[PDB]
Assembly symmetry: D3
Homo-oligomer: 227 residues x 6
């Protein structure tokens, strides 16, 4: 690996991945005896224990190309189970800020990354691991957290203008928008990794509280990863 310079054996098979290095540092406090196994290029990776299992929390940056690199290198270091925990913008009015979205699929616009990996324009089903996703539903249920299950649109251009953005994607079965799920799911299906994703709603495009929301969700994810 040329980006994640962690020593082999410093990355766990189970990894909770987040886009913000700051969130990785903040969530590492949930682990027992957290150790920083990587700092290169800002991709903070911490490894420690939780519920009797070794677990790692890694930073994936923003966008499909960035998360693809991070997943590929973590996998080369031994990782095979990934659960992305990020922030999203709801596309439907009934979802409130701070609530969660357990992703069942990702819509995406055909693009370079998918073409380079798939070798053609086939719309390969970009879905998470079935079992893993159900365990997440179980963990969030056990902790009495309010969540919704559904597809998300994985956008590549945060600032590109689209006057019909919300209507378009919500009418296509998506309840939220973010930027890395399609890559995570598809690459995982091709590579054989087990992946899933839960998102914290930080904004609603159709319409300290957030801090706690982020922490509560992270605990649910770690429970799932170590279940």
């Amino acid at each position: 690996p040329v980006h994640i310079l962690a020593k082999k054996g410093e990355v766990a098979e189970r990894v909770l991945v987040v886009g913000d290095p700051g969130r990785a540092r903040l969530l590492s406090t949930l682990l027992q005896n957290p150790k920083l196994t990587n700092e290169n290029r800002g991709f903070l990776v911490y490894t420690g224990k939780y519920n009797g299992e070794t677990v790692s929390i890694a930073t994936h940056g923003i966008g499909g190309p960035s998360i693809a690199i991070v997943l590929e290198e973590l996998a080369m270091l031994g990782a095979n189970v990934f659960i992305r925990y990020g922030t999203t913008g709801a596309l439907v009015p009934y979802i409130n800020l701070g609530e969660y979205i357990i992703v069942t699929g990702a819509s995406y616009n055909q693009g370079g990354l998918f073409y380079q990996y798939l070798r053609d324009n086939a719309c390969v089903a970009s879905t998470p691991d079935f079992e893993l996703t159900n365990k997440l539903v179980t963990s969030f249920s056990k902790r009495n957290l309010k969540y919704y299950v559904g597809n998300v649109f994985s956008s590549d251009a945060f600032y590109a203008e689209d006057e019909e953005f919300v209507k378009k994607w919500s009418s296509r079965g998506n309840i939220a928008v973010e930027m890395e799920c399609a890559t995570l799911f598809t690459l995982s299906k091709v590579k054989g990794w087990k992946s899933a994703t839960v998102l914290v709603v930080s904004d609603n495009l159709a319409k300290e509280e957030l801090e706690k929301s982020v922490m509560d969700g992270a605990k649910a994810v770690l429970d799932t990863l170590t279940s």
Copy 2:
């Protein structure tokens, strides 16, 4: 509707759809007081009761264009919950004939039907309803039936040659191949219908028993539809 000439009120909200008219006729025997509500164009539709609920068994023919027409017309007649029960060819060697595949997603090649409905080439997540799919897992589990959960490739050309067919689609996360799921899932997401799919493995591309397999599975599906 111009194809399914069923009278309004003759089609239930819950519909089990199969491609073969013969299978529809054969499965109608599982309903209480089955009535033929449509015969036009060979699209046999039967309506009756099961576990205290009105249910319909409809024929959708072969291919996305055919199933799209049938779903659209059944929906115009009141249907909003669809569960496709079909036959498939496994893409992985560990699945045996007669076993079942509970579909979690559908890979497809971009094409006319998807372009006409979506209005562009976006790879909209073609997934079934989460809840419904889990109920299917529950019903097949309760009846001790051997199943596998995973994505399928919805092909449009049964006889088109592809020397690397099995390797290609299996390496893309698909465990089986059929022809209508992608259309069913995507159209359902756009229209707001609740859909799912279970397939009976009749052949394995990587490698009276079938009769019973078909019947046993159908009972599991009807249980799900009326749960």
Copy 3:
């Protein structure tokens, strides 16, 4: 053959194909000593005589994927000449219901089935056999039938919305819309089959006993051609 379960020699070289199994049965009454050679999966196929010539009438269901399977299997059983006889919706105001359209080509949206067969997105000319199409014209005009010759758009989504549908496809040279011609024409060119298509106008997007008479009359004309 996985869908059409007919035996060796039951399927004729020349086949009149229709989408509706009801029409296959109905038209089978125009033949001499018709034999139901297949009914599996609803794909009714009949083989009888017309003008002392053996021919078959087969059901192809709705859509490209469906007709592709049927043609492939019929071909495996001996068929090599196919004339589709179906229903269409006119895209021009001057065409009346019950009249006919003799198809000269088919417009289509790329992808799906075409990509799997062609291996890329090239727009291969989707046209019927020149000779066979001219024989249909002679046959129809001979029976004093009202027909129009032109291209059609082969749609894959009967109910997909398009507020510019009519203007769009008519401005592109298509005079009617149906769903199987592009598949029938392209697959035939690739497999080496002789194909053509005649459509009965059952609706006019630009605008029961009578329609069945229209169907029956055109059927005779088509059968004349398939046995000429």
Copy 4:
């Protein structure tokens, strides 16, 4: 028009179009009282009479973009019937040099010009006028000329390499390759012009005086069609 500087009334409704300006000059000798109505940008356009009808012979250069400009401008000058008479390379073994191909359709790769005119990547049927094409057949047969009727692949890159070129396109139902057919047909369909095409086989990818005679003989049959 900025390329074809002919004045209104100098271009006929009926136009025989050729890619080579040298061919236009050579064929103008078949008209009665031929007059050069344009030479700008090398696009030679002659106008004269034939069989009691006014006809023009125009140069279209090489490629879809070039023929598109020429057709658009001739049309703005009153032209509405076009018959392209070009040269082609056969894709099948049985067609001999000097023989003709009457075109029934054109296969083509999507993109560029087609996207700009059609506004999306739909594979619109690229076919010639049915009536006009049959007349060409009648005229070539009436002059006892050897012709074959079939589709052609309209290539945009004469020199792009493709190892399986001949097999790929012939297996797709095309019997020859050239570069302007698809553009002519599709654009004519969109603009409402009546077009057709006959090609002289100058090479066979599957397998001088005699050629000039071939070119001359075919030109006469085309002119007969244009004036019928």
Copy 5:
């Protein structure tokens, strides 16, 4: 080569290419002892000397397919440095008629020719040779000519309608529109040829003697570059 019938040794390594055969003839007067080395298919090619260097001026017709054929054949005859000197329509208000645009890149719609050469739909950077382009700038500045440096949109359909044409392409970083740049640049990149382009603004989509002078003055600056 089947279009450019010049013999080896008759085409120079350095070639100034223009779309109009009339322009090639007019510019040949700038060379010393100009000799016509080809006129086949109207593609006029002159070869002479300039600044102690042998240079050819060749006609490329209109459109990517046409220029592709000409470049390929000239290259087979020994050419390896090409500078296109054409006419263009400005897409921005501030550029005046008769002024020049030194091209730094070409936007284009995928498909056809690009797909056949590149083998897929990748957006390969369509840029001119860096060194040669800077020399053009130096030469135009040395002759006190008004030029602007920027990208252009290489259109394939001169007459296709697009309501927001000017705003769309100017908002995409293009300052003018023409039809051969993208093909020239990309093909040169693939074949290893050194190419560049200067355009004379003959129209402004955003807003005779004076023009000929403009054309002549720019031709001299281009010839200086080619021989430097």
Copy 6:
């Protein structure tokens, strides 16, 4: 600004952008009185003085989507001139590690980000600012640095397999591969920003203190340009 949380006036008009936050910090030592204006989400931005000129050094992370967000937000904060300084893998054998490549254009696969910004699949010329790029050349040559000028392929999949990778992209005119240039160039053209790119060759796909010296030396040259 959602990611770069800097205040009004902290971000300079001219910005040197790098993908690695470690390099941003390291290079910030070349400035006078450097101030860390942002560290949110790891996107370190420093604003200091160079040759008595205010400039900023910003982190853009890896990939098109990441750099697009950073550029958009920096622009919202006052930035309008961007020079990317990164690392690349040469696609040609004659380029040594530690040497530099001054980018003249970027090849890319269509889709994703480009489709969302451009609204269709047009291959818009992805080029840097002509003037700014020439100043980089002067700056590097002035400091006696070994550089090569050419196009690069902006890949989105660092680890995707392609057994023909090197031959494919080098045959298409690219001399190196990285991941952000196409995005930087196209977005800049659309938004009206002046951009350029210089890359340090850290690997040769066609074949520690030394690399850091290479990085530091080139950084000075780039900073000279941004403050010229």
